[PDB]
Nucleic acid binder design. Structure first.
Length: 187
RNA sequence: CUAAGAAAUUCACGGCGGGCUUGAUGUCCGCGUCUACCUGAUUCACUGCCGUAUAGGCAG
């Protein structure tokens, strides 16, 4: 999109930036379910690939009316004293483009064993011989930790910012602001 | 370039027999331990779905 809003974490004595980053991402996800649509995507400008850090900025990309609607909604109630806003402003030009997609992994071999039990009626030893322990993949990606409201689990949502492309293509976003095809301007 | 330079201790073996340690006993007065704290560092790498798949994706 052509408009962006930069949301920076204020430094807090009581909270690390990753905790406030996760809470802001969670309330943003609830705001995108409350809004609907696939037109709104996010980006993390001070990302550090070396230490796997998301920084302390979130850059949301949408139209201008969407950003001005999201300024005055109750998804920022309780977070306004931990954050500072810029203005919804036009993206500078030219900028490279990159994708912001969630990267899931097979980090629980036992869950895949239970899936093979449910789909092939096998046993525990058949699943453990068919799925060994070496298939687990640990990620060198920064992440936010959310709690679901439908189910009662807490999960690390790992994020990877894709390679820089000189142009953007058409694609929608999920209700997490993440790329299901769409691209955001990286600056 | 060394008080340098060298070196086979080893064959065999019955330690056992016997025994009353005993009497007696006042530990004991007295006592101000206080003061003040972020356990949270992403610290719950989870649950499930599509797929024949462990290959690869997806959902919260």
């Amino acid at each position: 999109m052509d408009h962006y809003l930069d949301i920076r974490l204020r430094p807090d004595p009581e909270f690390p930036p990753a905790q406030l980053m996760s809470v802001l991402f969670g309330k943003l996800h609830q705001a995108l379910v409350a809004q609907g649509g696939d037109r709104i995507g996010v980006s993390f400008p001070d990302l550090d690939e070396s230490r796997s850090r998301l920084g302390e900025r979130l850059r949301i990309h949408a139209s201008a009316d969407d950003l001005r609607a999201l300024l005055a909604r109750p998804w920022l109630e309780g977070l306004r004293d931990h954050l500072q806003f810029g203005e919804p402003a036009v993206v500078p030009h030219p900028t490279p483009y990159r994708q912001v997609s969630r990267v899931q992994a097979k980090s629980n071999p036992e869950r895949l064993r239970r899936r093979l039990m449910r789909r092939h009626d096998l046993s525990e030893e058949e699943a453990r011989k068919r799925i060994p322990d070496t298939v687990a993949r640990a990620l060198d990606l920064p992440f936010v930790t959310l709690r679901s409201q439908s189910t009662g689990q807490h999960f690390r949502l790992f994020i990877r910012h894709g390679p820089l492309q000189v142009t953007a293509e058409e694609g929608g976003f999920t209700c997490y602001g993440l790329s299901k095809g769409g691209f955001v301007p990286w600056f």
